[PDB]
Amino acid sequence: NTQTVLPFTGLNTPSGVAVDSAGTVYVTDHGNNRVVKLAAGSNTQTVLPFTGLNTPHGVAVDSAGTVYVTDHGNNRVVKLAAGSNTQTVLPFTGLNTPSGVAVDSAGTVYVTDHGNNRVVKLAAGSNTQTVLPFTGLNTPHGVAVDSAGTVYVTDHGNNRVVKLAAGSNTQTVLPFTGLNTPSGVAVDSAGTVYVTDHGNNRVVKLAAGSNTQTVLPFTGLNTPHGVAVDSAGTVYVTDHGNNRVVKLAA
Ligand SMILES: [Zn+2]
Ligand SMILES: [Zn+2]
Ligand SMILES: [Zn+2]
Ligand SMILES: [Zn+2]
Ligand SMILES: [Zn+2]
């Protein structure tokens, strides 16, 4: 229940955040064009060996430790395997300012194509990307995917979070209320969905199937951007406006 600013150093507008299965926190550093990681309990960040990023936004990490980053300004998505020093460009096409990124258990990569009002996915090893059947989006921002392959997207212009069930492709608006420009989104191991309410300076959680949302006890947030949740329920938020990454111990 305790809130602590993590010992990242030299951050310039942290944006995206992810946590891997070990509790390591990965953060995109907008102004610095870099991605930094901090193991649980470590006080020493590591700068990942990406190169040539232009305002990196979203970050995701798969169960193998491979790191995926949206290169917002260069309209591309890059990845870095664990321990590797050389980034690979993913064969997405036609992107315009990709923002959020997520990866499922099969290595399929989901990207919110901000400027094109669409969400696209790309299986590992494939040369054809698939536009997902979301409807009525007015600029998607954050994306997350759960074990069922269900995809969650924050819809900037409609102040809502939408769910796409795998298979039936039924789109459902999650019953959040009072959102003001939802941005980041995450889903924990229980299926609970977390959203950064960018305009209201708060983080909100909603169990699937519930009409009770819970404001998480973060304090003094200024345009919170990214959110991630680890297996123990610890929530990490990038406080874009305050240049910090905040942890809330479960
Ligand atoms: Zn940003
Ligand atoms: Zn963007
Ligand atoms: Zn946005
Ligand atoms: Zn922001
Ligand atoms: Zn974002």
PDB file of C-alpha atoms and ligand atoms in Angstrom:
ATOM      1  CA  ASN A   1       0.000   0.000   0.000  1.00  0.00           C
ATOM      2  CA  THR A   2       3.155   2.139   0.042  1.00  0.00           C
ATOM      3  CA  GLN A   3       4.067   4.508  -2.806  1.00  0.00           C
ATOM      4  CA  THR A   4       7.735   4.966  -3.727  1.00  0.00           C
ATOM      5  CA  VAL A   5       9.419   6.705  -6.648  1.00  0.00           C
ATOM      6  CA  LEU A   6      11.792   4.194  -8.256  1.00  0.00           C
ATOM      7  CA  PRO A   7      15.539   4.984  -8.433  1.00  0.00           C
ATOM      8  CA  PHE A   8      15.705   5.575 -12.160  1.00  0.00           C
ATOM      9  CA  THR A   9      18.187   8.325 -12.977  1.00  0.00           C
ATOM     10  CA  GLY A  10      18.191  10.927 -15.702  1.00  0.00           C
ATOM     11  CA  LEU A  11      14.684  10.167 -16.949  1.00  0.00           C
ATOM     12  CA  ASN A  12      13.215  12.655 -19.442  1.00  0.00           C
ATOM     13  CA  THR A  13       9.422  12.136 -19.662  1.00  0.00           C
ATOM     14  CA  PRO A  14       9.053   8.405 -18.999  1.00  0.00           C
ATOM     15  CA  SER A  15       6.217   7.075 -21.113  1.00  0.00           C
ATOM     16  CA  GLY A  16       5.728   3.355 -21.561  1.00  0.00           C
ATOM     17  CA  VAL A  17       6.307   0.828 -18.809  1.00  0.00           C
ATOM     18  CA  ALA A  18       6.332  -2.971 -18.688  1.00  0.00           C
ATOM     19  CA  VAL A  19       7.250  -5.598 -16.120  1.00  0.00           C
ATOM     20  CA  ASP A  20       8.518  -9.068 -16.939  1.00  0.00           C
ATOM     21  CA  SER A  21       7.857 -12.275 -15.050  1.00  0.00           C
ATOM     22  CA  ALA A  22      10.713 -11.504 -12.597  1.00  0.00           C
ATOM     23  CA  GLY A  23       9.498  -8.038 -11.550  1.00  0.00           C
ATOM     24  CA  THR A  24      12.008  -6.109 -13.657  1.00  0.00           C
ATOM     25  CA  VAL A  25      10.587  -2.745 -14.738  1.00  0.00           C
ATOM     26  CA  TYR A  26      11.177  -1.510 -18.291  1.00  0.00           C
ATOM     27  CA  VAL A  27      10.561   2.139 -19.133  1.00  0.00           C
ATOM     28  CA  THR A  28      10.749   4.193 -22.327  1.00  0.00           C
ATOM     29  CA  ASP A  29      12.585   7.470 -21.737  1.00  0.00           C
ATOM     30  CA  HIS A  30      11.010   9.876 -24.273  1.00  0.00           C
ATOM     31  CA  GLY A  31      13.382  12.802 -24.138  1.00  0.00           C
ATOM     32  CA  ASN A  32      16.421  10.541 -23.976  1.00  0.00           C
ATOM     33  CA  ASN A  33      15.333   8.204 -26.810  1.00  0.00           C
ATOM     34  CA  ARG A  34      16.235   5.163 -24.747  1.00  0.00           C
ATOM     35  CA  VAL A  35      14.770   2.220 -22.878  1.00  0.00           C
ATOM     36  CA  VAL A  36      15.948   1.532 -19.333  1.00  0.00           C
ATOM     37  CA  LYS A  37      15.328  -1.390 -17.022  1.00  0.00           C
ATOM     38  CA  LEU A  38      15.483  -1.821 -13.246  1.00  0.00           C
ATOM     39  CA  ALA A  39      15.447  -5.254 -11.603  1.00  0.00           C
ATOM     40  CA  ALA A  40      13.326  -5.674  -8.491  1.00  0.00           C
ATOM     41  CA  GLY A  41      15.224  -4.276  -5.507  1.00  0.00           C
ATOM     42  CA  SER A  42      18.088  -3.002  -7.656  1.00  0.00           C
ATOM     43  CA  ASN A  43      19.196   0.612  -7.351  1.00  0.00           C
ATOM     44  CA  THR A  44      21.080   0.555 -10.679  1.00  0.00           C
ATOM     45  CA  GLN A  45      19.229   0.945 -13.966  1.00  0.00           C
ATOM     46  CA  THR A  46      20.525  -0.601 -17.185  1.00  0.00           C
ATOM     47  CA  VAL A  47      20.243   1.239 -20.497  1.00  0.00           C
ATOM     48  CA  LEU A  48      19.169  -1.216 -23.204  1.00  0.00           C
ATOM     49  CA  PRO A  49      21.285  -1.196 -26.385  1.00  0.00           C
ATOM     50  CA  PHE A  50      18.671   0.213 -28.740  1.00  0.00           C
ATOM     51  CA  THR A  51      19.845   2.749 -31.318  1.00  0.00           C
ATOM     52  CA  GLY A  52      18.222   5.450 -33.414  1.00  0.00           C
ATOM     53  CA  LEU A  53      14.879   5.654 -31.613  1.00  0.00           C
ATOM     54  CA  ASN A  54      12.739   8.757 -32.129  1.00  0.00           C
ATOM     55  CA  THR A  55      10.601   9.433 -29.032  1.00  0.00           C
ATOM     56  CA  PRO A  56      10.045   5.786 -28.022  1.00  0.00           C
ATOM     57  CA  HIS A  57       6.645   5.279 -26.599  1.00  0.00           C
ATOM     58  CA  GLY A  58       5.329   1.847 -25.777  1.00  0.00           C
ATOM     59  CA  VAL A  59       7.295  -1.106 -24.412  1.00  0.00           C
ATOM     60  CA  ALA A  60       6.379  -4.757 -23.892  1.00  0.00           C
ATOM     61  CA  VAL A  61       8.313  -7.829 -22.800  1.00  0.00           C
ATOM     62  CA  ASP A  62       7.520 -11.424 -23.679  1.00  0.00           C
ATOM     63  CA  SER A  63       7.991 -14.500 -21.506  1.00  0.00           C
ATOM     64  CA  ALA A  64      11.409 -15.061 -23.133  1.00  0.00           C
ATOM     65  CA  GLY A  65      12.600 -11.611 -22.053  1.00  0.00           C
ATOM     66  CA  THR A  66      12.435 -10.142 -25.549  1.00  0.00           C
ATOM     67  CA  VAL A  67      11.735  -6.408 -25.398  1.00  0.00           C
ATOM     68  CA  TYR A  68       9.529  -4.637 -27.953  1.00  0.00           C
ATOM     69  CA  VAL A  69       9.470  -0.850 -28.381  1.00  0.00           C
ATOM     70  CA  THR A  70       7.357   1.470 -30.518  1.00  0.00           C
ATOM     71  CA  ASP A  71       9.584   3.981 -32.300  1.00  0.00           C
ATOM     72  CA  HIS A  72       6.883   6.658 -32.442  1.00  0.00           C
ATOM     73  CA  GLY A  73       8.769   9.172 -34.562  1.00  0.00           C
ATOM     74  CA  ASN A  74      10.187   6.645 -37.068  1.00  0.00           C
ATOM     75  CA  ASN A  75       6.875   4.789 -37.548  1.00  0.00           C
ATOM     76  CA  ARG A  76       8.321   1.396 -36.678  1.00  0.00           C
ATOM     77  CA  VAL A  77       8.470  -1.296 -34.008  1.00  0.00           C
ATOM     78  CA  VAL A  78      11.800  -2.767 -32.890  1.00  0.00           C
ATOM     79  CA  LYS A  79      12.688  -5.672 -30.646  1.00  0.00           C
ATOM     80  CA  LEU A  80      15.693  -6.840 -28.671  1.00  0.00           C
ATOM     81  CA  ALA A  81      16.153 -10.395 -27.403  1.00  0.00           C
ATOM     82  CA  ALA A  82      17.419 -10.890 -23.865  1.00  0.00           C
ATOM     83  CA  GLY A  83      21.184 -10.438 -23.686  1.00  0.00           C
ATOM     84  CA  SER A  84      21.313  -9.385 -27.343  1.00  0.00           C
ATOM     85  CA  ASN A  85      22.930  -6.118 -28.393  1.00  0.00           C
ATOM     86  CA  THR A  86      21.324  -5.674 -31.837  1.00  0.00           C
ATOM     87  CA  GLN A  87      17.762  -4.502 -32.441  1.00  0.00           C
ATOM     88  CA  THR A  88      15.514  -6.053 -35.082  1.00  0.00           C
ATOM     89  CA  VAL A  89      12.899  -4.121 -37.038  1.00  0.00           C
ATOM     90  CA  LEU A  90       9.515  -5.835 -37.194  1.00  0.00           C
ATOM     91  CA  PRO A  91       7.838  -5.997 -40.624  1.00  0.00           C
ATOM     92  CA  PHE A  92       4.881  -3.762 -39.799  1.00  0.00           C
ATOM     93  CA  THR A  93       3.855  -1.554 -42.712  1.00  0.00           C
ATOM     94  CA  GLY A  94       2.023   1.707 -43.131  1.00  0.00           C
ATOM     95  CA  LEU A  95       2.323   2.830 -39.518  1.00  0.00           C
ATOM     96  CA  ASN A  96       1.784   6.459 -38.561  1.00  0.00           C
ATOM     97  CA  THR A  97       3.077   7.214 -35.054  1.00  0.00           C
ATOM     98  CA  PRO A  98       2.686   3.776 -33.426  1.00  0.00           C
ATOM     99  CA  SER A  99       2.112   4.167 -29.701  1.00  0.00           C
ATOM    100  CA  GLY A 100       1.198   1.194 -27.538  1.00  0.00           C
ATOM    101  CA  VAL A 101       2.597  -2.298 -27.942  1.00  0.00           C
ATOM    102  CA  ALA A 102       1.737  -5.678 -26.419  1.00  0.00           C
ATOM    103  CA  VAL A 103       2.874  -9.259 -26.983  1.00  0.00           C
ATOM    104  CA  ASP A 104       1.036 -12.517 -26.289  1.00  0.00           C
ATOM    105  CA  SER A 105       2.275 -15.987 -25.346  1.00  0.00           C
ATOM    106  CA  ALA A 106       2.801 -16.970 -29.008  1.00  0.00           C
ATOM    107  CA  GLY A 107       5.002 -13.924 -29.674  1.00  0.00           C
ATOM    108  CA  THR A 108       2.306 -12.139 -31.637  1.00  0.00           C
ATOM    109  CA  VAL A 109       2.806  -8.365 -31.434  1.00  0.00           C
ATOM    110  CA  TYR A 110      -0.081  -5.882 -31.145  1.00  0.00           C
ATOM    111  CA  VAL A 111       0.433  -2.186 -31.929  1.00  0.00           C
ATOM    112  CA  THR A 112      -1.888   0.809 -31.677  1.00  0.00           C
ATOM    113  CA  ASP A 113      -1.412   2.704 -34.947  1.00  0.00           C
ATOM    114  CA  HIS A 114      -2.292   6.064 -33.412  1.00  0.00           C
ATOM    115  CA  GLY A 115      -2.332   8.178 -36.555  1.00  0.00           C
ATOM    116  CA  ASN A 116      -4.339   5.595 -38.536  1.00  0.00           C
ATOM    117  CA  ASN A 117      -7.032   4.973 -35.902  1.00  0.00           C
ATOM    118  CA  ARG A 118      -6.445   1.218 -35.866  1.00  0.00           C
ATOM    119  CA  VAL A 119      -4.905  -1.670 -33.948  1.00  0.00           C
ATOM    120  CA  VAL A 120      -2.710  -4.083 -35.911  1.00  0.00           C
ATOM    121  CA  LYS A 121      -1.212  -7.431 -35.003  1.00  0.00           C
ATOM    122  CA  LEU A 122       1.672  -9.366 -36.525  1.00  0.00           C
ATOM    123  CA  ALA A 123       2.452 -12.991 -35.740  1.00  0.00           C
ATOM    124  CA  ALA A 124       6.076 -13.944 -35.282  1.00  0.00           C
ATOM    125  CA  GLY A 125       7.535 -15.038 -38.604  1.00  0.00           C
ATOM    126  CA  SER A 126       4.713 -13.507 -40.695  1.00  0.00           C
ATOM    127  CA  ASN A 127       5.023 -10.879 -43.437  1.00  0.00           C
ATOM    128  CA  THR A 128       1.353  -9.796 -43.327  1.00  0.00           C
ATOM    129  CA  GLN A 129      -0.138  -7.717 -40.510  1.00  0.00           C
ATOM    130  CA  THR A 130      -3.793  -7.947 -39.499  1.00  0.00           C
ATOM    131  CA  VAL A 131      -6.027  -4.988 -38.675  1.00  0.00           C
ATOM    132  CA  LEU A 132      -8.198  -6.007 -35.736  1.00  0.00           C
ATOM    133  CA  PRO A 133     -12.021  -5.579 -35.900  1.00  0.00           C
ATOM    134  CA  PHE A 134     -12.390  -2.732 -33.433  1.00  0.00           C
ATOM    135  CA  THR A 135     -15.127  -0.306 -34.393  1.00  0.00           C
ATOM    136  CA  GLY A 136     -15.799   3.300 -33.552  1.00  0.00           C
ATOM    137  CA  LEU A 137     -12.282   3.933 -32.317  1.00  0.00           C
ATOM    138  CA  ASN A 138     -11.345   7.593 -32.189  1.00  0.00           C
ATOM    139  CA  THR A 139      -7.555   7.184 -31.796  1.00  0.00           C
ATOM    140  CA  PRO A 140      -6.285   4.151 -29.854  1.00  0.00           C
ATOM    141  CA  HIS A 141      -3.424   4.614 -27.440  1.00  0.00           C
ATOM    142  CA  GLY A 142      -2.683   1.837 -24.972  1.00  0.00           C
ATOM    143  CA  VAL A 143      -2.990  -1.879 -25.728  1.00  0.00           C
ATOM    144  CA  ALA A 144      -2.774  -5.028 -23.588  1.00  0.00           C
ATOM    145  CA  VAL A 145      -3.478  -8.718 -24.255  1.00  0.00           C
ATOM    146  CA  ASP A 146      -4.411 -11.441 -21.761  1.00  0.00           C
ATOM    147  CA  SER A 147      -3.999 -15.219 -21.726  1.00  0.00           C
ATOM    148  CA  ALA A 148      -7.208 -15.719 -23.746  1.00  0.00           C
ATOM    149  CA  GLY A 149      -5.829 -13.550 -26.537  1.00  0.00           C
ATOM    150  CA  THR A 150      -8.383 -10.916 -25.612  1.00  0.00           C
ATOM    151  CA  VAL A 151      -7.121  -7.462 -26.587  1.00  0.00           C
ATOM    152  CA  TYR A 152      -7.769  -4.329 -24.514  1.00  0.00           C
ATOM    153  CA  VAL A 153      -7.353  -0.874 -26.044  1.00  0.00           C
ATOM    154  CA  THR A 154      -7.730   2.609 -24.640  1.00  0.00           C
ATOM    155  CA  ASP A 155      -9.817   4.810 -26.945  1.00  0.00           C
ATOM    156  CA  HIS A 156      -8.597   8.394 -26.528  1.00  0.00           C
ATOM    157  CA  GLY A 157     -11.459  10.307 -28.137  1.00  0.00           C
ATOM    158  CA  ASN A 158     -14.327   8.319 -26.622  1.00  0.00           C
ATOM    159  CA  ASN A 159     -12.961   8.217 -23.054  1.00  0.00           C
ATOM    160  CA  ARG A 160     -13.301   4.482 -22.920  1.00  0.00           C
ATOM    161  CA  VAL A 161     -11.529   1.144 -22.817  1.00  0.00           C
ATOM    162  CA  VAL A 162     -12.678  -1.521 -25.270  1.00  0.00           C
ATOM    163  CA  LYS A 163     -12.208  -5.278 -25.100  1.00  0.00           C
ATOM    164  CA  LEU A 164     -12.025  -7.621 -28.110  1.00  0.00           C
ATOM    165  CA  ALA A 165     -12.681 -11.265 -27.315  1.00  0.00           C
ATOM    166  CA  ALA A 166     -10.669 -13.712 -29.386  1.00  0.00           C
ATOM    167  CA  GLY A 167     -12.733 -15.916 -31.663  1.00  0.00           C
ATOM    168  CA  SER A 168     -16.160 -14.286 -31.503  1.00  0.00           C
ATOM    169  CA  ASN A 169     -14.575 -10.859 -32.166  1.00  0.00           C
ATOM    170  CA  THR A 170     -17.275  -9.372 -29.958  1.00  0.00           C
ATOM    171  CA  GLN A 171     -16.237  -5.851 -28.945  1.00  0.00           C
ATOM    172  CA  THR A 172     -17.267  -4.806 -25.421  1.00  0.00           C
ATOM    173  CA  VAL A 173     -16.899  -1.406 -23.802  1.00  0.00           C
ATOM    174  CA  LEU A 174     -15.581  -1.938 -20.293  1.00  0.00           C
ATOM    175  CA  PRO A 175     -17.815  -0.213 -17.688  1.00  0.00           C
ATOM    176  CA  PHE A 176     -15.254   2.300 -16.470  1.00  0.00           C
ATOM    177  CA  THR A 177     -16.757   5.690 -15.622  1.00  0.00           C
ATOM    178  CA  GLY A 178     -15.511   9.248 -15.460  1.00  0.00           C
ATOM    179  CA  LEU A 179     -12.417   8.643 -17.558  1.00  0.00           C
ATOM    180  CA  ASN A 180     -10.666  11.698 -19.031  1.00  0.00           C
ATOM    181  CA  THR A 181      -8.356  10.570 -21.858  1.00  0.00           C
ATOM    182  CA  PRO A 182      -7.424   7.027 -20.818  1.00  0.00           C
ATOM    183  CA  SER A 183      -3.903   6.253 -21.949  1.00  0.00           C
ATOM    184  CA  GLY A 184      -2.001   3.249 -20.646  1.00  0.00           C
ATOM    185  CA  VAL A 185      -3.716  -0.065 -20.000  1.00  0.00           C
ATOM    186  CA  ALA A 186      -2.631  -3.295 -18.345  1.00  0.00           C
ATOM    187  CA  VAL A 187      -4.203  -6.600 -17.315  1.00  0.00           C
ATOM    188  CA  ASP A 188      -3.033  -8.571 -14.287  1.00  0.00           C
ATOM    189  CA  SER A 189      -3.020 -12.336 -13.805  1.00  0.00           C
ATOM    190  CA  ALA A 190      -6.568 -12.167 -12.377  1.00  0.00           C
ATOM    191  CA  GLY A 191      -8.027 -10.545 -15.486  1.00  0.00           C
ATOM    192  CA  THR A 192      -8.322  -7.196 -13.730  1.00  0.00           C
ATOM    193  CA  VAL A 193      -7.839  -4.248 -16.079  1.00  0.00           C
ATOM    194  CA  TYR A 194      -5.845  -1.158 -15.052  1.00  0.00           C
ATOM    195  CA  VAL A 195      -5.980   2.183 -16.879  1.00  0.00           C
ATOM    196  CA  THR A 196      -4.105   5.445 -16.514  1.00  0.00           C
ATOM    197  CA  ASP A 197      -6.646   8.274 -16.490  1.00  0.00           C
ATOM    198  CA  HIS A 198      -4.290  10.755 -18.105  1.00  0.00           C
ATOM    199  CA  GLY A 199      -6.597  13.766 -17.810  1.00  0.00           C
ATOM    200  CA  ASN A 200      -7.729  13.076 -14.227  1.00  0.00           C
ATOM    201  CA  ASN A 201      -4.221  12.288 -12.907  1.00  0.00           C
ATOM    202  CA  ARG A 202      -5.173   8.893 -11.511  1.00  0.00           C
ATOM    203  CA  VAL A 203      -4.936   5.139 -12.113  1.00  0.00           C
ATOM    204  CA  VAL A 204      -8.114   3.018 -12.019  1.00  0.00           C
ATOM    205  CA  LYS A 205      -8.722  -0.735 -11.892  1.00  0.00           C
ATOM    206  CA  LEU A 206     -11.808  -2.695 -12.920  1.00  0.00           C
ATOM    207  CA  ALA A 207     -12.199  -6.420 -12.457  1.00  0.00           C
ATOM    208  CA  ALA A 208     -13.639  -7.977 -15.599  1.00  0.00           C
ATOM    209  CA  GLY A 209     -17.402  -8.354 -15.310  1.00  0.00           C
ATOM    210  CA  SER A 210     -17.583  -5.820 -12.473  1.00  0.00           C
ATOM    211  CA  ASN A 211     -19.256  -2.429 -12.180  1.00  0.00           C
ATOM    212  CA  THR A 212     -16.975  -1.322  -9.340  1.00  0.00           C
ATOM    213  CA  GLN A 213     -13.851   0.576 -10.320  1.00  0.00           C
ATOM    214  CA  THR A 214     -11.160   1.311  -7.756  1.00  0.00           C
ATOM    215  CA  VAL A 215      -8.993   4.422  -7.755  1.00  0.00           C
ATOM    216  CA  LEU A 216      -5.513   3.301  -6.798  1.00  0.00           C
ATOM    217  CA  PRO A 217      -3.818   5.304  -4.002  1.00  0.00           C
ATOM    218  CA  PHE A 218      -1.214   7.069  -6.095  1.00  0.00           C
ATOM    219  CA  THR A 219      -0.750  10.703  -5.090  1.00  0.00           C
ATOM    220  CA  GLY A 220       0.150  13.901  -6.888  1.00  0.00           C
ATOM    221  CA  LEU A 221       0.221  12.410 -10.369  1.00  0.00           C
ATOM    222  CA  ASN A 222       0.658  14.726 -13.360  1.00  0.00           C
ATOM    223  CA  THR A 223      -0.448  13.233 -16.686  1.00  0.00           C
ATOM    224  CA  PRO A 224       0.247   9.579 -15.794  1.00  0.00           C
ATOM    225  CA  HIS A 225       0.970   7.665 -18.965  1.00  0.00           C
ATOM    226  CA  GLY A 226       1.920   4.014 -18.753  1.00  0.00           C
ATOM    227  CA  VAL A 227       0.820   1.294 -16.352  1.00  0.00           C
ATOM    228  CA  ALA A 228       2.027  -2.243 -15.674  1.00  0.00           C
ATOM    229  CA  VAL A 229       1.196  -4.755 -12.951  1.00  0.00           C
ATOM    230  CA  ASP A 230       3.361  -7.643 -11.808  1.00  0.00           C
ATOM    231  CA  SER A 231       2.326 -11.067 -10.511  1.00  0.00           C
ATOM    232  CA  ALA A 232       2.293  -9.944  -6.875  1.00  0.00           C
ATOM    233  CA  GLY A 233      -0.115  -7.125  -7.812  1.00  0.00           C
ATOM    234  CA  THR A 234       2.434  -4.324  -7.610  1.00  0.00           C
ATOM    235  CA  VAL A 235       1.413  -1.487  -9.924  1.00  0.00           C
ATOM    236  CA  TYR A 236       3.913   0.718 -11.763  1.00  0.00           C
ATOM    237  CA  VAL A 237       2.940   4.031 -13.347  1.00  0.00           C
ATOM    238  CA  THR A 238       4.976   6.464 -15.427  1.00  0.00           C
ATOM    239  CA  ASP A 239       4.319   9.996 -14.164  1.00  0.00           C
ATOM    240  CA  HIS A 240       5.039  11.709 -17.465  1.00  0.00           C
ATOM    241  CA  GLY A 241       4.522  15.238 -16.122  1.00  0.00           C
ATOM    242  CA  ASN A 242       6.608  14.699 -12.970  1.00  0.00           C
ATOM    243  CA  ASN A 243       9.483  12.850 -14.681  1.00  0.00           C
ATOM    244  CA  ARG A 244       9.213   9.792 -12.440  1.00  0.00           C
ATOM    245  CA  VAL A 245       8.141   6.147 -12.230  1.00  0.00           C
ATOM    246  CA  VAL A 246       5.993   5.360  -9.201  1.00  0.00           C
ATOM    247  CA  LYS A 247       5.556   1.941  -7.600  1.00  0.00           C
ATOM    248  CA  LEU A 248       2.559   1.008  -5.425  1.00  0.00           C
ATOM    249  CA  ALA A 249       3.239  -2.112  -3.357  1.00  0.00           C
ATOM    250  CA  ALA A 250       0.205  -4.422  -3.315  1.00  0.00           C
TER     251      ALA A 250
HETATM  252 ZN    ZN B   1       4.772  10.741 -23.704  1.00  0.00          ZN
HETATM  253 ZN    ZN B   2       1.343   8.624 -29.601  1.00  0.00          ZN
HETATM  254 ZN    ZN B   3      -2.436   9.034 -27.543  1.00  0.00          ZN
HETATM  255 ZN    ZN B   4       1.306  11.296 -21.635  1.00  0.00          ZN
HETATM  256 ZN    ZN B   5       1.424   6.042 -24.344  1.00  0.00          ZN
END
